[PDB]
């Protein structure tokens, strides 16, 4: 395909951004951290387009692969905010992860409404992954709001996965 | 599809159990922990039955894919046990890991007797992953450290053996 | 189908990780020999497949070089062995060095998926190089490892814009 090639490139952007942030952190370099933050954002921004772009075209599977990159970028962006001192990036990484969590439920709702259980479960998996990042973003800021929101989002994915299990075992 | 869809749904139970676990682990709160423990504890029981059901028909993979969920479920169940200090739960999670390694050994031993090379390697991978959890469940009962080491020593011993047979062709 | 050999070598690297994590200075040396065997054996499968043609099995073999060098990197720390840091580093640079070439070859052929898979080994090798470099405090490798990621992000960033022209 063609749209997946960007996503595979975007995933390497988040990966190189994660490595750069880890090697720039301990030896107090803010320049590498300025790359890793910018590298992660655009991989999320480009994934945000491809997620929406694949959703409309009629692909809910290609959209999901983009939604995980929001999770992976918001995950890496949380560290850059955490390792540095920017309480401004943690405010953006949550919105990025929360968007993926919100969109996953939609594709889940649509896939379950169409009878595509497998595609639904992949959306439920990204729902749990977004809850994981949001939970992590909340323990080092002590905000029980994000930790509570993550609880229901993770719990909601839990029950829907329980339902798809019985629906298969008939 | 098929009962595989149950397993993929079961894997999400262990994943969601882990996120809840992490949350209540740090942010002091045992109500989530017993929910997440039960969530993780449940998918482990579900995976155990599908393993047996897959063993009988003939499909060893569905059995293997279920055995991996026992390893992944036992991992989350051990984690709550370490933080919550429940030395009894560390045991149930350990027994869960001990079964998957043992059951994989059969599928590993069985696949090698038929000449199905990578069906064995998939069982050997599940054996090494189960040995890994027990090491964590021990890192300090020194016997279990032998049990986890012993399982790790033999999965390695066979993978280099199976790799000698593949490189000649 | 040297692919079946590679998956077996990964179980060698994995069991070496379990044994190295547990510790017995004998076990740490048995895990060291276990991983160092799968890395030198992955190097052979890489060379043979890269020579006959196959650029994926070479990459699939190179990924175990990163993972074998990664597992051996821990044994170096837990045993206090700066001589071991050389082998784990030597493999990581090799996997990184070979990946760039395989990336270069794949880009000339139009196998953009293959380049990105080769570029992933660049980041995975660059991360290990960084990990091996913060342990002894060698800032030469820490810049070298940073550059490896800076190249992988830079080359993959083009493939992201070059591919969306036909989305």
Numbering used by the authors:
A (entry chain C): 1 to 170
B (entry chain A): 1 to 139, 142 to 171
C (entry chain B): 2 to 24, 29 to 172
From the paper:
Circular tandem repeat proteins (‘cTRPs’) are de novo designed protein scaffolds (in this and prior studies, based on antiparallel two-helix bundles) that contain repeated protein sequences and structural motifs and form closed circular structures. While these cTRP constructs have many favorable properties, we have previously noted that their ability to self-assemble from smaller subunits is compromised by relatively limited contacts and small surface areas that are involved in packing between repeats and subunits. Based on those results, we hypothesized that a new generation of computationally designed cTRP proteins with increased repeat size (corresponding to longer secondary structural elements that increase both particle thickness and the number of buried contacts between repeats and protein subunits) would improve both the energetics and the stoichiometric control of self-association. In this study, we describe the de novo design of thick cTRPs (‘tcTRPs’) with repeats composed of longer helical bundles that form a new underlying repeat topology and demonstrate their solution and assembly behaviors, their structural features via X-ray crystallography and CryoEM, and their ability to be functionalized with additional folded protein domains.
To accomplish this, we generated and purified a construct that again contained only three repeats per subunit (termed ‘tcTRP93’). This construct was also expressed and purified at relatively high levels (yield ~5 mg per liter of culture) and eluted from a final SEC column at a volume corresponding to the same approximate mass as the full-length protein (left), indicating probable assembly into a higher-order trimeric species with 9 repeats total. The purified construct, also like the full-length protein, did not display significant unfolding behavior at 95° in a CD spectrum (right). The purified construct from the final SEC column was crystallized and its structure was determined at 3.2 Å resolution. This analysis confirmed a homotrimeric assembly that closely mirrored the dimensions, topology, and side-chain packing interactions found in the full-length tcTRP9 designed protein. In both cases, the assembled particles (‘tcTRP93-VHH3’) display three separate copies of the antiviral VHH domain in a trimeric organization extending from one face of the construct. The most active construct in our experiments (tcTRP93-VHH6813) displayed the lowest, sub-nanomolar values for both binding assays (KD and EC50 ~ 0.43 and 0.64 nM, respectively, and viral neutralization IC50 ~ 0.78 nM).
